[PDB]
Design a protein around this ligand. Structure first.
Ligand SMILES: CCCCCCCCCCCCCCCCCC(=O)OC[C@H](COP(=O)([O-])OCC(O)COP(=O)([O-])OC[C@@H](COC(=O)CCCCCCCCCCCCCCCCC)OC(=O)CCCCCCCCCCCCCCCCC)OC(=O)CCCCCCCCCCCCCCCCC
Ligand SMILES: COC1=C(OC)C(=O)C(C/C=C(\C)CC/C=C(\C)CC/C=C(\C)CC/C=C(/C)CC/C=C(/C)CC/C=C(\C)CC/C=C(\C)CC/C=C(\C)CC/C=C(/C)CCC=C(C)C)=C(C)C1=O
Ligand SMILES: CCCCCCCCCCCCCCCCCC(=O)OC[C@H](COP(=O)([O-])OCC[N+](C)(C)C)OC(=O)CCCCCCCCCCCCCCCCC
Ligand SMILES: CCCCCCCCCCCCCCCCCC(=O)OC[C@H](COP(=O)([O-])OCC[N+](C)(C)C)OC(=O)CCCCCCCCCCCCCCCCC
Ligand SMILES: CCCCCCCCCCCCCCCCCC(=O)OC[C@H](COP(=O)([O-])OCC[N+](C)(C)C)OC(=O)CCCCCCCCCCCCCCCCC
Ligand SMILES: CCCCCCCCCCCCCCCCCC(=O)OC[C@H](COP(=O)(O)OCCN)OC(=O)CCCCCCCCCCCCCCCCC
Ligand SMILES: CCCCCCCCCCCCCCCCCC(=O)OC[C@H](COP(=O)(O)OCCN)OC(=O)CCCCCCCCCCCCCCCCC
Ligand SMILES: CCCCCCCCCCCCCCCCCC(=O)OC[C@H](COP(=O)(O)OCCN)OC(=O)CCCCCCCCCCCCCCCCC
Ligand code: SF4
Ligand code: SF4
Ligand code: SF4
Lengths: 115, 155, 188, 97, 318, 360, 178, 70, 56
């Protein structure tokens, strides 16, 4: 209940700050003021066109490595096990195959931002 | 007395707006060279609380420092309009004041006051960085003199 | 009183002036911030002919230069008379927001106007404002106007996009004049 | 040592502007606490101290008057309140006050 | 009494970040052969308050081409996540004691990244889009590196708590056992806080203002508060994890003082880094992390798997 | 983020400088050149003055020439400070900007002492030099220059071996020597790509032929090599400043020809011919004999050229100003191939670009 | 002559000690720590900032500031309506309408200088044969309107009467050079 | 000089000392001169609940010793 | 110039170079602002004889 109250208090504080920011000052709104910025000229495009990012393979690899992270994270409770040899071998194999995947992608130029 | 409380509140908001002046990272010419010489360690505008911000949304005063070309003028007007409401203009140098050396040119706006409302005119070609700092402090005094809450209360 | 003190004073009576930063088109466009549009008698039996700011100012300048108008009264009106319902429907069509009207009697509408007018700042609306909204314009019959002061009255259907484009969302921001059908013009 | 000498110069600067009221006055008007040789006291009330141990640029300064030509310049200090002769000396066109 | 505890956590943190802005301006000035603000306050101490009042009395200036819901949600989200991230830190007793404190920290940091992304996409401008995409790349790289670093360090520790970190560092720091992890964690905290060298989300030179280029005053101040609160928090987390303050059961005041001194030193180190170095390119940051830190931290994670097994120094569960 | 095409629209600082120059007299058209490249004011003044001197068939006195070389190297230090520090500011580091701008403030104080203005010092003239130096100026220039190499060393240590700066500048905007020659860069990009060319060594104009210095030469043609070239040019400018301070000659300040240079004020107030020549030079100006010349001077940003056409009157018929930044920005699109926004910013920084001289 | 800035002479080969030194430079971030030390030294230096409105920046007697019209020690105006300062004015900022005075002296009736048009080049003060127009040391004369910078003869004579105690001293210190 | 940053540094120092010290003191005040008695596991929570039932004032921090046994 | 010995040692070690020899603040080694009056030389063609303008 305590953490819930602190979360709600922080949310209410941020809402109070932005409500003060919006209801305190004086408003004078017109079209040239609220136009998009674009460094002092009218934008050619609509800023919603396709962007064509260059690190898409790195993003998918990040998804896979994040799930490898999720696999690796119960290690602080895994080291409390009674066997510890199969645990050590399994952790070594997991880190080794993750590193092998990273090395293969590096060799095949996956993380090189193909334009 | 409501007049006294309103006057003190107005003095407080004027103190805030004059102690936190954020000019825009926007110059045009040799006058902007002197403007960053005013940013230099000698006449520290950051010591005065004056610090550049690149976006006009986070700017407070446009320091028009340079020659306002005809091709440049829509950009300057758009950039000024994109500022939030308590905005000021310091024209700097003869070009921004009244055209200066290029007054009779076919491509120069004869003074930036034809385009934007100018609060403070700083003369020189270039005005020294000391002179631009003088204009900045004169602008601070000018917005110290403003009485928005008192005019509202007697409105 | 102005006639009594200054007997040759030009008196200019415009209609509800529209333009940028007005309190007529922007008022009806700011009706979108509530649930519906509370009009009296569904916006019918109320006829308006709004007039442009540039037309009014040009009329004033031509009045201060004109060899005539040495004591005359002018009626500065727009070229088209609209019903209030059709005008508000056209405004919300140009805004592309939505349009749900609502019949509200003038008694409780004046109550709501007084409630809004109870404000230390500039009120959003007041009882006098809603009364002037629901008072119909008169037919300018014998008075001179912009036409013989040398000003062509620009129609609202022409100079309306420069006011109401602020109040659109991003979806409908880049819409032309032809995307909105013009309001029906009454004669009466 | 050096630190105790720095502290001695600091307490000299603190107790060198008259009293606590004078120290607070110069600290909230001129935003510095320094002791210089008085060379000025012009007719309008400006003070014009100097100190040659400081580097070039900070070696001459003015404490402005709190009143000039009917204007309460306690906080609204101005760069044009210097008369021309002290203006020349303060901008270091000559070494002679 | 708990609301009083919330106030005594929240209000000092906000005053600390405002004076962090002051300290940043003065330290950068004195490293730039100039001063900081010394006019607004007696020694510039009223300058952050003047800046805050000016920002909250300027208009917020809602734009036309803008998704307003996300445009408003994002800065409030950033500030509330910064304070929520401040919640579970022990000095030496936390306000809220969590078993999985580090996991909570990681989740809240990722949600702060989402606040930046939603602001950048909602403010429908090209420079905002550029800043959002740069934020995506940056958080990919530092997220994978930070997860591995914390895994290895807390494998040297016991559970995922932080009082356990205090009891682990009761005798000696964790900097001496794992200093390469401390270096990579310092660089990763820089990347998480979007600070120089590799800020790249509010890039003043490559972009105009990045994701804040359409945010006028108000919510812009909220974003700034969230960023600087995150700066102090990442330095505080670094000194809790690695530079363990002295803990005694009888009195915790010296623990709080030691934590304060080391957190101040690391915050000043952040300002020092900003004064010293130029900016990376945001592809160079990804290349640097994924080609230097990630292989080294994978190897060091394997080494810290093997270390308690072959030294028999497995930490206790509690 | 990858850049597919650069198209720099210029002309937002075009003020019709050449048309105004052809509408004014030569002495009246002199302070336009202070505002063409407003970082090397004395250098542009020297270029225009040498063009008018060549048309007039007169030479400035040796003291004027040595003063012009001394202030030419002072402008070179000012311009390379500005270029290096603003390039580093665009990259992301600002402390060298603040340090070297304190030094730049000292040199602007030197300008304000030798003339009236700190920047647009209408000082170098077709009649040699307008006014002689005040008596403490050479000693103060020496005191500045003896401490200046430490500041270059501080910036050099901050940037040169820094791996972030190296990753930001190395193999960025690589220009081959043949492409630089074909694009007509001609200023610093040539010696950054390895072309051994400097006008002060190949076509010397003032006493540069009798000062001694080295021309730094790059080998990779990238931003890092150009930055190294600018730093080494600052050091060689310090070397030339030392030589000029040692070998300043005791002569007169302007060419002793009252039909070109104005006489001294005492002679003007005591003499008839001097007053007549003062009146005519300050109302009509000297008549330049008709002809066209192209005078090129190694300005810090590059080869600064003036094509002057005189029709025989006291006003120039035509004055074309060739700015190096024009050719550099024309070549910006070629240099920005296979790069992103950040290194495009780096390439803009590494090209010594001021838009007053580009737009005119 | 010339020199190389990035070319290396031969190579230092491959050695275990040199390899260890390069490895420590890469891993321990030695040049980064060196840059940290440099800016730390700058932190512990003394700043060059002057307290502005109390400590003004240094200047020179040649400094071009605000224009002024001077007088003889008798009080008579120095200007003799000869117009060659506006002839040499490269910005055409001066207007010198003139007529004979009541005593028959050649004086000006309109002497306007547009400070928003003037480029502050001193050509008028170096062209004036009687030292009438000068550019005195005033630079803190920024105004809140464009019109206040359109000076006339009364304003210029007022500036000359205001700044004569400094302008005369500067001309005394400077006139042997010019 | 460089010591001009020390006012801001000291304000940050007191603002970082205050939360931890206040949290410890508030924990002591609320728990009656002892610490928070954190419960990481169900056994510790069971001990806290048993103490709350034993005390009789529905407060786990009211420790009961040998005075309850005759 | 007015710095303690410990601070000077720290500055020199942190910079790697000696700073008190070439510090960038000017104290007293600069020229005096008030200078003695000059006597500028006249150049050639002030000869009063053999100085016709057609020969130069
Ligand atoms: C502080 C601002 C208020 C006082 C200002 C004042 O009166 O200054 C006069 C005066 C300085 O004027 P100055 O004569 O121009 O400076 C002498 C040197 O040029 C100063 O040059 P310096 O850097 O060589 O001298 C600094 C000196 C003294 O520095 C200190 O004592 C700073 C604190 C060190 C701990 O440092 C040391 O002795 C070694 C310190 C090593 C630290 C590691 O004396 C001081 O500032 C004394 C130090 C005061 C320290 C106050 C610390 C607490 C601040 C408030 C916290 C709440
Ligand atoms: C030759 O060619 C040319 C160029 O090419 C080279 C040009 O360039 C050019 C253009 C030239 C110019 C535009 C010149 C401009 C100058 C420069 C570019 C150089 C100057 C230097 C810089 C721009 C870099 C500055 C570097 C710094 C280190 C300064 C630091 C700046 C910052 C923005 C970071 C610090 C932050 C701030 C200043 C603001 C921080 C404060 C806040 C946001 C406050 C927020 C806090 C709160 C909301 C707290 C509130 C909470 C509370 C609890 C408080 C309680 C309150 C109460 C009232 C009780 C021209 C024309 C040109 O010709
Ligand atoms: C840092 C945390 C806290 C941040 C928030 C700041 C808290 C402290 C605020 C103190 C000042 C409160 C009033 C600020 C008003 C700022 C805007 C303003 O002056 O508007 C003038 C306007 C004046 O209105 P008006 O009637 O002149 O009309 C405005 C339209 N014109 C001028 C074009 C005709 O509004 C007010 O005066 C409103 C005052 C509200 C006072 C509330 C208390
Ligand atoms: C049962 C209760 C749970 C909630 C469901 C009922 C209420 C919401 C219904 C869905 C509304 C969707 C909608 O209107 O979207 C339009 C808007 C987009 O509209 P917009 O912002 O583009 O345009 C509005 C423009 N003006 C204001 C000028 C008219 O989208 C949202 O509101 C979605 C934002 C996120 C909402 C949830 C946030 C949760 C916290 C995140 C951290
Ligand atoms: C929190 C505690 C304090 C931490 C340090 C904080 C103070 C110092 C801050 C310095 C400035 C940091 C600012 C950001 C800098 C960003 C650049 C950067 O760091 O890039 C990383 C750089 C990258 O260098 P790089 O990118 O130049 O490398 C070139 C690589 N190519 C050519 C492919 C581009 O360095 C590293 O990645 C090193 C990481 C740390 C390595 C630590 C190794 C320790 C030793 C291990 C064991 C050795 C023995 C082996 C076994 C022996 C058995 C007997
Ligand atoms: C089981 C395996 C995993 C164990 C854990 C370690 C994880 C390492 C993951 C990454 C390994 C990738 C290796 C292959 C590779 O991709 O190398 C690429 C690299 C050149 O790429 P790059 O640096 O980007 O260069 C750009 C142009 N020059 O190539 C090079 O730089 C060449 C390097 C050659 C030497 C490799 C190291 C040998 C070490 C031997 C130690 C013996 C004790
Ligand atoms: C509370 C209501 C009154 C607020 C202050 C009104 C009076 C005022 O502004 O006084 C000016 C004084 C000094 O400010 P200033 O005039 O800029 O000084 C220049 C000196 N170089 O200003 C000050 O001393 C600053 C006063 C700040 C008051 C507290 C602000 C909130 C924290
Ligand atoms: C602007 C809109 C913002 C919306 C987003 C808000 C984000 C909030 C901050 C980030 C939260 C990330 C997720 C954190 C989950 C809680 C972490 C955790 O470990 O909780 C478990 C903990 C007790 O577990 P344990 O530590 O094991 O203790 C047992 C013995 N001590 O504690 C608990 O069991 C407590 C469980 C509740 C804790 C979270 C409460 C959240 C409340 C809702 C907030 C949003 C409401 C909707 C929007 C409102 C209007 C804007
Ligand atoms: S007024 Fe002079 S210095 Fe300023 S921009 Fe114009 S030409 Fe340059
Ligand atoms: S200084 Fe130059 S531009 Fe100004 S009035 Fe005199 S001659 Fe004209
Ligand atoms: S000020 Fe001098 S130059 Fe100008 S008209 Fe008068 S006397 Fe002639």
């Amino acid at each position: 209940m305590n953490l819930y109250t602190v979360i709600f208090i922080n949310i209410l504080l941020s809402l109070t700050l932005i409500l003060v920011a919006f209801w305190l000052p004086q408003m004078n709104l017109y079209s040239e003021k609220a136009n998009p910025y674009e460094c002092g000229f009218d934008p050619t495009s609509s800023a919603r066109l396709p962007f064509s990012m260059k690190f898409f393979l790195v993003a998918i690899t990040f998804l896979l490595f994040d799930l490898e992270i999720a696999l690796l994270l119960p290690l602080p409770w895994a080291i409390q096990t009674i066997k510890t040899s199969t645990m050590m071998i399994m952790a070594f194999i997991l880190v080794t195959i993750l590193s092998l995947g990273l090395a293969y992608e590096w060799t095949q130029k996956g993380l090189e931002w193909t334009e | 007395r409501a007049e006294y409380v309103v006057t003190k509140l107005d003095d407080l908001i004027n103190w805030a707006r004059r102690s936190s002046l954020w000019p825009m990272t926007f110059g045009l010419a040799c006058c902007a060279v002197e403007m960053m010489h005013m940013a230099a360690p000698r006449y520290d505008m950051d010591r005065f609380g004056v610090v550049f911000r690149a976006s006009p949304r986070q700017a407070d005063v446009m320091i028009v420092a340079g020659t306002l070309t005809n091709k440049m003028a829509p950009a300057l007007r758009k950039v000024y309009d994109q500022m939030p409401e308590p905005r000021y203009v310091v024209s700097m140098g003869s070009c921004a004041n009244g055209g200066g050396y290029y007054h009779y040119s076919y491509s120069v706006v004869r003074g930036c006051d034809r385009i934007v409302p100018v609060d403070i005119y700083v003369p020189g070609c270039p005005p020294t960085a000391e002179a631009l700092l003088y204009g900045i402090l004169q602008l601070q005094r000018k917005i110290k003199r403003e009485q928005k809450l008192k005019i509202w209360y007697r409105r | 009183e102005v006639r009594s003190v200054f007997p040759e004073a030009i008196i200019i009576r415009p209609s509800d002036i529209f333009g940028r930063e007005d309190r007529f088109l922007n008022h009806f466009a700011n009706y979108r911030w509530f649930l519906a549009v509370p009009l009296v008698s569904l916006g019918f039996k109320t006829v308006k002919q709004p007039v442009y700011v540039a037309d009014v100012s040009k009329g004033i300048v031509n009045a201060t230069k004109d060899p005539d108008a040495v004591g005359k009264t002018f009626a500065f009106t727009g070229p088209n008379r609209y019903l209030l319902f059709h005008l508000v429907k056209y405004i919300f069509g140009m805004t592309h927001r939505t349009f749900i009207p609502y019949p509200l009697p003038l008694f409780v509408y004046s109550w709501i106007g007084k409630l809004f007018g109870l404000s230390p700042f500039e009120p959003w609306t007041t009882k006098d404002k809603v009364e002037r909204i629901h008072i119909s314009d008169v037919m300018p019959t014998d008075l001179p106007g912009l036409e013989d002061l040398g000003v062509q009255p620009t129609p609202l259907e022409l100079k309306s996009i420069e006011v109401l484009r602020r109040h659109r969302t991003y979806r409908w921001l880049s819409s032309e004049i032809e995307e909105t059908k013009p309001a029906k013009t009454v004669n009466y | 040592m050096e630190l105790v000498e720095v502290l001695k110069r600091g307490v000299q600067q603190v107790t060198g502007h008259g009293g606590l009221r004078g120290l607070l006055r110069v600290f909230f008007r001129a935003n510095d606490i320094r002791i210089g040789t008085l060379v000025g006291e012009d007719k309008y009330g400006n003070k014009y101290y100097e100190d040659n141990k400081q580097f070039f640029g900070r070696h001459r300064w003015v404490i402005y008057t709190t009143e000039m030509n009917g204007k309460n310049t306690f906080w609204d200090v101005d760069g044009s309140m210097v008369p021309p002769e002290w203006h020349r000396w303060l901008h270091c066109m000559t070494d002679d006050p | 009494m708990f609301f009083i505890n919330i106030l005594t956590l929240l209000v000092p943190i906000l005053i600390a970040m405002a004076f962090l802005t002051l300290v940043e301006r003065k330290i950068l000035g004195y490293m730039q052969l100039r001063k900081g603000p010394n006019i607004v306050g007696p020694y510039g101490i009223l300058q952050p308050f003047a800046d805050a009042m000016k920002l909250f009395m300027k208009e917020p200036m809602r734009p036309l081409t803008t998704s307003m819901s996300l445009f408003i949600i994002a800065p409030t989200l950033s500030l509330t996540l910064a304070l929520s991230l401040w919640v579970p830190l022990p000095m030496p007793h936390p306000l809220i004691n969590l078993n999985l404190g580090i996991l909570f920290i990681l989740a809240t940091s990722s949600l702060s990244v989402y606040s930046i992304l939603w602001s950048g996409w909602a403010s429908n401008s090209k420079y905002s889009l550029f800043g959002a995409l740069r934020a995506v790349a940056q958080t990919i790289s530092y997220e994978v590196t930070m997860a591995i670093i914390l895994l290895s360090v807390l494998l040297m520790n016991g559970s995922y708590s932080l009082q356990t970190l205090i009891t682990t560092q009761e005798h000696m720091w964790l900097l001496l056992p794992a200093w390469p992890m401390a270096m990579m964690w310092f660089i990763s905290t820089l990347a998480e806080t979007n600070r120089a060298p590799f800020d790249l989300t509010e890039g003043e030179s490559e972009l105009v203002s990045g994701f804040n280029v359409e945010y006028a005053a108000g919510p812009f101040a909220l974003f700034f508060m969230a960023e600087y609160t995150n700066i102090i928090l990442m330095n505080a987390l670094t000194t809790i994890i690695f530079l363990g303050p002295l803990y005694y059961i009888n009195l915790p005041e010296l623990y709080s003082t030691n934590f304060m001194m080391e957190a101040l030193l690391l915050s000043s180190t952040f300002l020092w880094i900003r004064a010293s170095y130029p900016r990376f390119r945001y592809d160079q940051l990804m290349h640097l992390l994924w080609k230097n830190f990630l292989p080294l931290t994978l190897a060091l994670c394997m080494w810290h798997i093997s270390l308690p097994i072959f030294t028999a120094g497995v930490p206790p569960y509690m | 983020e990858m850049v597919r095409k650069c198209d720099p629209h210029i002309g937002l600082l075009h003020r019709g400088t050449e048309k105004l120059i052809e509408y004014k007299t030569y002495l009246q058209a002199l302070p336009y050149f202070d505002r063409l490249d407003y970082v090397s004011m004395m250098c542009n003044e020297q270029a225009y003055s040498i063009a008018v001197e060549k048309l007039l068939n007169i030479q400035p006195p040796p003291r004027a020439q040595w003063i012009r070389v001394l202030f030419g190297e002072i402008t070179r230090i000012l311009n390379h400070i500005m270029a290096v520090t603003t390039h580093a500011l665009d990259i992301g580091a600002m402390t060298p900007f603040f340090w070297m701008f304190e030094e730049r403030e000292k040199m602007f104080e030197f300008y304000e002492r030798v003339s009236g203005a700190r920047m647009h010092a209408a000082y170098i003239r077709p009649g040699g030099v307008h006014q002689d130096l005040p008596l403490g100026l050479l000693d103060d220039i020496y005191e500045f220059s003896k401490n200046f190499s430490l500041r270059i060393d501080e910036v050099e240590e901050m940037l040169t071996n820094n791996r972030i700066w190296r990753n930001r500048t190395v193999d960025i905007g690589v220009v081959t020597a043949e492409d630089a020659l074909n694009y007509g860069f001609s200023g610093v990009m040539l010696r950054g790509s390895g072309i051994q060319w400097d006008l002060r060594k190949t076509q010397p104009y003032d006493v540069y032929d009798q000062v001694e210095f080295d021309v730094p030469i790059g080998s990779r043609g990238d931003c890092y090599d150009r930055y190294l070239c600018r730093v080494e040019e600052m050091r060689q400018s310090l070397r030339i400043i030392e030589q000029c301070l040692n070998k300043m000659p005791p002569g007169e300040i302007k060419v002793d020809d009252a039909k070109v240079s104005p006489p001294k004020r005492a002679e003007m107030k005591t003499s008839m011919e001097s007053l007549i020549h003062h009146f005519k030079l300050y109302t009509e100006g000297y008549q330049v004999p008709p002809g066209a010349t192209y005078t090129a001077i190694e300005a810090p940003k590059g080869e600064f050229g003036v094509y002057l056409v005189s029709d025989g009157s006291s006003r120039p018929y035509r004055c074309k100003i060739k700015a190096p930044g024009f050719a550099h920005l024309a070549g910006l699109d070629k240099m920005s191939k296979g790069h992103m926004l950040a290194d495009v910013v780096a390439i803009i920084g590494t090209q010594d670009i001021v838009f007053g001289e580009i737009d005119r | 002559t010339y020199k190389y800035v990035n070319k290396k002479e031969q190579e230092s080969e491959v050695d275990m000690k040199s390899a260890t030194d390069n490895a420590a430079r890469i891993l321990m971030w030695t040049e980064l720590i060196r840059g940290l030390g440099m800016t730390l030294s700058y932190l512990f230096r003394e700043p060059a900032t002057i307290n502005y409105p109390f400590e003004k920046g240094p200047l020179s007697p040649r400094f071009r500031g605000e224009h002024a019209l001077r007088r003889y020690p008798s009080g008579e105006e120095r200007c003799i309506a000869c117009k060659l300062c506006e002839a040499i004015c490269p910005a055409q900022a001066i207007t010198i309408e003139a007529e004979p005075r009541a005593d028959g002296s050649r004086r000006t009736t309109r002497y306007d200088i547009d400070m928003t048009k003037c480029i502050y080049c001193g050509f008028c003060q170096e062209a004036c044969p009687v030292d009438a127009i000068v550019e005195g040391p005033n630079f803190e004369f920024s105004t809140e309107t464009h019109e206040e910078l359109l000076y006339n003869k009364e304003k210029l004579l007022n500036n000359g009467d205001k700044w004569e105690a400094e302008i005369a001293a500067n001309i005394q210190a400077d006139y042997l050079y010019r | 000089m460089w010591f001009e940053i020390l006012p801001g540094l000291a304000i940050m120092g007191v603002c970082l000392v205050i939360p931890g010290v206040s949290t410890a003191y508030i924990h002591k005040f609320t728990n009656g001169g002892k610490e928070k008695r954190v419960a990481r596991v169900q056994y510790q929570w069971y001990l806290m609940e048993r103490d709350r039932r034993i005390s009789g004032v529905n407060r786990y921090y009211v420790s009961k010793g040998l005075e309850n046994i005759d | 110039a007015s710095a303690t010995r410990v601070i000077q040692k720290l500055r020199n070690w942190a910079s790697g170079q000696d700073l008190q020899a070439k510090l960038q603040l000017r104290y007293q080694e600069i020229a005096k602002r008030t200078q003695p009056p000059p006597k500028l030389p006249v150049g050639p063609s002030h000869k009063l004889s053999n100085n016709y303008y057609c020969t130069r």
